[PDB]
Amino acid sequence: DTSKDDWLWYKQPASQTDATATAGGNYGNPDNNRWQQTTLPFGNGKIGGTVWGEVSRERVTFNEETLWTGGPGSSTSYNGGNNETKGQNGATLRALNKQLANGAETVNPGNLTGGENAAEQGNYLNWGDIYLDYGFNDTTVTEYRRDLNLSKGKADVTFKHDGVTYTREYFASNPDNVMVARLTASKAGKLNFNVSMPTNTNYSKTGETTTVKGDTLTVKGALGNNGLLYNSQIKVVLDNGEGTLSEGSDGASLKVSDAKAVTLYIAAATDYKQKYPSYRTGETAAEVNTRVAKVVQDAANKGYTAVKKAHIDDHSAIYDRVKIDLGQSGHSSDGAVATDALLKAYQRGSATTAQKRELETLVYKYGRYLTIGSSRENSQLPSNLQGIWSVTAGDNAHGNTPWGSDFHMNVNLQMNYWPTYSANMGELAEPLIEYVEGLVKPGRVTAKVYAGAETTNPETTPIGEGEGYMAHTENTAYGWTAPGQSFSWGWSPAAVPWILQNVYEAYEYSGDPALLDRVYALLKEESHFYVNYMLHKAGSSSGDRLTTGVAYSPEQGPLGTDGNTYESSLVWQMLNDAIEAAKAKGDPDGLVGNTTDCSADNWAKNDSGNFTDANANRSWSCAKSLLKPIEVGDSGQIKEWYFEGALGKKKDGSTISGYQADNQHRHMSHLLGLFPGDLITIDNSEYMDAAKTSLRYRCFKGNVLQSNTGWAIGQRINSWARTGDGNTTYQLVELQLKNAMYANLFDYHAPFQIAGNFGNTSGVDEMLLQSNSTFTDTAGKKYVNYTNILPALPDAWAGGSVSGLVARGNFTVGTTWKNGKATEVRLTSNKGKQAAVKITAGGAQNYEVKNGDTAVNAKVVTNADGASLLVFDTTAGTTYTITKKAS
Ligand SMILES: OC[C@H]1O[C@@H](O[C@H]2[C@H](O)[C@@H](O)[C@@H](O)O[C@@H]2CO)[C@H](O)[C@@H](O)[C@H]1O
Numbered sequence: 018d019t020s021k022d023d024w025l026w027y028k029q030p031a032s033q034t035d036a037t038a039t040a041g042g043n044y045g046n047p048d049n050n051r052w053q054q055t056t057l058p059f060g061n062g063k064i065g066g067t068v069w070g071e072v073s074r075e076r077v078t079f080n081e082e083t084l085w086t087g088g089p090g091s092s093t094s095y096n097g098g099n100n101e102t103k104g105q106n107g108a109t110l111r112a113l114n115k116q117l118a119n120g121a122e123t124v125n126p127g128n129l130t131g132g133e134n135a136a137e138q139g140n141y142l143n144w145g146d147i148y149l150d151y152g153f154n155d156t157t158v159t160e161y162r163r164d165l166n167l168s169k170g171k172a173d174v175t176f177k178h179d180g181v182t183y184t185r186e187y188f189a190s191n192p193d194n195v196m197v198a199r200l201t202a203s204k205a206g207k208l209n210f211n212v213s214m215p216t217n218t219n220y221s222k223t224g225e226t227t228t229v230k231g232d233t234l235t236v237k238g239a240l241g242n243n244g245l246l247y248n249s250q251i252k253v254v255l256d257n258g259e260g261t262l263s264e265g266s267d268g269a270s271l272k273v274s275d276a277k278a279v280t281l282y283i284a285a286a287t288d289y290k291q292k293y294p295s296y297r298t299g300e301t302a303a304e305v306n307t308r309v310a311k312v313v314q315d316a317a318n319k320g321y322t323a324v325k326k327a328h329i330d331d332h333s334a335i336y337d338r339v340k341i342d343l344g345q346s347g348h349s350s351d352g353a354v355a356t357d358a359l360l361k362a363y364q365r366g367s368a369t370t371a372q373k374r375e376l377e378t379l380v381y382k383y384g385r386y387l388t389i390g391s392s393r394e395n396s397q398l399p400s401n402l403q404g405i406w407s408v409t410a411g412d413n414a415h416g417n418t419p420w421g422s423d424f425h426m427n428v429n430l431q432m433n434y435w436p437t438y439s440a441n442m443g444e445l446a447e448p449l450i451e452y453v454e455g456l457v458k459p460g461r462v463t464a465k466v467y468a469g470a471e472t473t474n475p476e477t478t479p480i481g482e483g484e485g486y487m488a489h490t491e492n493t494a495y496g497w498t499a500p501g502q503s504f505s506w507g508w509s510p511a512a513v514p515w516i517l518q519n520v521y522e523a524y525e526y527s528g529d530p531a532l533l534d535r536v537y538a539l540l541k542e543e544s545h546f547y548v549n550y551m552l553h554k555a556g557s558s559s560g561d562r563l564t565t566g567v568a569y570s571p572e573q574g575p576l577g578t579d580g581n582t583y584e585s586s587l588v589w590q591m592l593n594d595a596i597e598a599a600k601a602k603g604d605p606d607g608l609v610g611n612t613t614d615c616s617a618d619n620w621a622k623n624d625s626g627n628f629t630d631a632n633a634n635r636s637w638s639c640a641k642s643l644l645k646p647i648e649v650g651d652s653g654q655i656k657e658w659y660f661e662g663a664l665g666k667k668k669d670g671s672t673i674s675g676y677q678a679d680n681q682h683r684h685m686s687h688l689l690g691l692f693p694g695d696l697i698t699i700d701n702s703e704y705m706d707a708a709k710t711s712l713r714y715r716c717f718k719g720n721v722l723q724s725n726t727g728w729a730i731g732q733r734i735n736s737w738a739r740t741g742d743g744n745t746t747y748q749l750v751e752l753q754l755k756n757a758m759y760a761n762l763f764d765y766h767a768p769f770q771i772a773g774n775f776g777n778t779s780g781v782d783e784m785l786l787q788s789n790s791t792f793t794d795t796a797g798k799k800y801v802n803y804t805n806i807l808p809a810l811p812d813a814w815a816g817g818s819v820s821g822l823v824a825r826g827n828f829t830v831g832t833t834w835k836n837g838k839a840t841e842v843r844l845t846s847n848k849g850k851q852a853a854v855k856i857t858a859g860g861a862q863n864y865e866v867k868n869g870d871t872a873v874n875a876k877v878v879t880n881a882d883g884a885s886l887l888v889f890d891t892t893a894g895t896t897y898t899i900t901k902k903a904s
């Protein structure tokens with residue numbers, strides 16, 4: 018019974034599905050454009066398919082997460098893009114900073130660049146395709162449907178051809194490390210097809226072979242760019258013997274005749290490893306082949322029913338954690354509409370309320386689905402710009418694949434991991450944590466070359482004990498931590514502080530001690546790096562403060578300013594978090610310090626880069642207090658640059674060079690303290706009005722809401738949510754759905770970029786629940802990371818319910834509301850932490866707490882603004898119910 022499952026579903030194959038939305042760069046080929054707008058993704062965090070659902074020549078576009086060009090072996094001098102001749106072991110940066118300190122508003126930052134060789138950078142590759150050719154004379158069908166069952170983690174295709182009902186089922190199992198295709202024909206003798214696996218023609222190879230052994234084909238080779246070994250295998254299994262399984266008449270296929278029912282077991286691997294400097298397992302071609310062979314052998318020995326059960330079990334265990342009911346229709350509703358038609362209706366303004374709710378909740382749920390498919394606990398790599406799904410390939414960076422489908426760390430990679438915790442998929446953040454840990458070794462090289470932070474043995478010094486690791490915007494599978502070849506996107510060292518927010522949240526949401534140790538080690542060394550090498554006393558262009566020196570604000574404005582709001586906001590957050598992590602550990606390193614004898618003069622350095630006063634206070638508390646990251650400009654906006662006057666102008670009325678004149682720059686790099694950070698909050702709201710002014714300019718021309726890239730709308734959804742304005746937040750949700758989603762619900766730039774799918778999920782979470790702020794009651798008592806129920810509920814969602822969301826401190830949160838106000842909150846304490854609960858839609862002072870059959874003593878505390886929390890002790894594993902006071 019699949020009647021209660023969430024489906025995306027279509028009444029026609031990918032080839033006949035609407036692909037008329039903006040294609041974007043790199044998708045001028047019709048077939049590639051069709052791919053990104055209309056195919057349905059599935060994956061196990063490692064391998065992925067995108068299903069076309071073609072009646073005759075069926076196609077599943079195929080990926081493996083580690084098929085990456087570039088890195089060691091791409092040249093004989095691979096050093097992660099670092100240009101020693103430009104960086105001069107920090108000397109270049111030190112001299113440019115002195116020019117800024119001496120009053121310059123900008124400098125020529127041309128030698129703060131690197132990463133010049135595109136072959137060394139490399140990119141993510143589409144592996145190729147699986148073709149299942151049914152031979153058919155005509156493609157004439159009835160009762161056709163293709164779907165993606167998000168609830169069971171599988172794709173389905175069904176049609177009736179010539180009296181024969183055909184079925185296809187595809188999934189990729191994490192427990193058994195295998196992709197499965199189940200193919201059936203209704204009447205015996207009537208399942209005939211050829212199975213092949215061509216690799217993308219557009220990457221170079223060395224010694225590729227397609228081979229047929231038993232019921233198994235193997236494509237096998239090495240990448241020509243870097244020697245990376247790849248191997249994929251399809252094992253065909255006819256149902257209990259019946260059918261002619263023969264080698265294809267071209268040596269490169271397997272032919273099935275006169276079945277019945279078939280199960281294909283599909284597996285793939287490379288010899289990649291996240292292991293600096295070699296990035297290889299050290300396997301031979303023959304070893305890779307044996308490995309891959311086992312996975313399909315074992316899958317085949319388990320059999321279809323067993324592997325399917327284990328996959329659905331594993332998938333639904335994570336997928337079913339969160340339920341949402343806004344009064345949506347679904348695939349089983351009377352009058353149900355296909356997903357492509359629903360999208361068109363929503364865009365037209367012809368969709369009913371129920372259909373609008375169906376699209377909004379489907380998109381929400383798809384962001385959770387896509388996380389499960391691209392980013393599992395045992396993935397070798399986090400989700401990239403496209404998750405794990407791509408059709409394009411070329412050897413070099415900045416080539417055939419847009420932005421190399423890379424790890425883009427000046428908003429996109431961060432966005433990928435915004436909903437991971439709040440949407441109850443905490444374990445799925447593990448590959449991100451490992452990736453950032455993976456940046457330490459190569460980033461120590463960058464830190465040395467560009468900022469003069471030398472770790473004595475960068476390969477064997479534990480994380481936390483080195484001098485610092487530096488990385489920038491464009492990153493890869495191979496420690497490409499160098500700044501890019503052009504400064505005006507390439508230089509962004511605060512990328513690391515930022516991604517460390519995503520990493521630190523793993524601890525904030527769980528309270529796990531093992532995670533605390535890992536996040537502490539990362540924060541300690543990056544905080545060390547900034548304090549000792551990056552920060553300097555600002556010159557006159559940036560006022561009285563420590564700044565981060567030569568800066569670029571992603572991705573507009575002047576090149577090489579004396580810090581900026583982006584870097585200062587992020588370093589402020591990082592120090593805030595480092596201090597919190599140190600405190601949770603007992604501050605065993607004595608690094609928190611204090612603000613006694615605290616001055617930006619404490620950062621004076623001699624010619625060598627050693628501090629003039631070895632003993633001056635440069636503690637984490639001191640540095641934090643000296644950043645002063647937020648300044649309000651003459652349009653009442655948060656300034657993006659410290660010399661800013663009115664919006665996008667200098668104090669003299671001239672235009673800020675490189676500022677996007679219509680005010681709609683996609684990035685909002687100066688508002689990171691509002692979201693995802695904790696600098697500007699509803700409780701600490703000194704700069705809330707300015708953040709809202711800045712947001713209005715970045716989203717509106719007068720009273721008219723502007724479109725933008727899918728990810729940019731996604732960040733705006735989250736930012737507006739943190740302000741408490743549900744109505745404006747919802748307008749941005751509608752905008753994203755109308756203007757940045759293809760028929761397959763992939764978010765687009767254009768072209769397809771997955772970050773906005775993840776940002777949508779996060780944004781909806783922040784509407785319904787926030788947990789990042791600090792409450793101060795009238796007596797000065799602080800409640801950090803209090804649970805905020807319904808902080809930005811739109812008037813459009815008058816009633817509904819949600820369960821399974823996660824708040825910081827490790828609480829599971831369900832809430833039911835009607836007439837715009839909470840009727841029940843269910844709070845499950847997972848760690849036994851003291852609860853502190855705000856009910857924004859209703860007022861917590863009007864409610865009371867129970868533990869099953871008993872009343873809980875909850876204290877009502879309020880602040881200056883007449884807002885209240887319910888404050889109560891809890892025990893691990895207990896669910897508390899909060900309901901309106903009853904007589
Ligand atoms: O060259 C790498 C940088 O590309 C920027 O994206 C450009 C894109 O390459 C160009 O074709 C044009 O259309 O504008 C885009 C945005 O300016 C990235 O934004 C930057 O991060 C680098 O990847």
Ligand SMILES: C[C@@H]1O[C@@H](O)[C@@H](O)[C@H](O)[C@@H]1O
Nearest residue numbers: 402420425429572728766
């Ligand atoms: C993946 C890329 O990330 C940043 O470079 C943005 O400025 C681009 O517009 C694009 O979204």
Ligand SMILES: [Ca+2]
Nearest residue numbers: 391396398399
């Ligand atoms: Ca992955």
Ligand SMILES: [Ca+2]
Nearest residue numbers: 525694695789
């Ligand atoms: Ca926080």
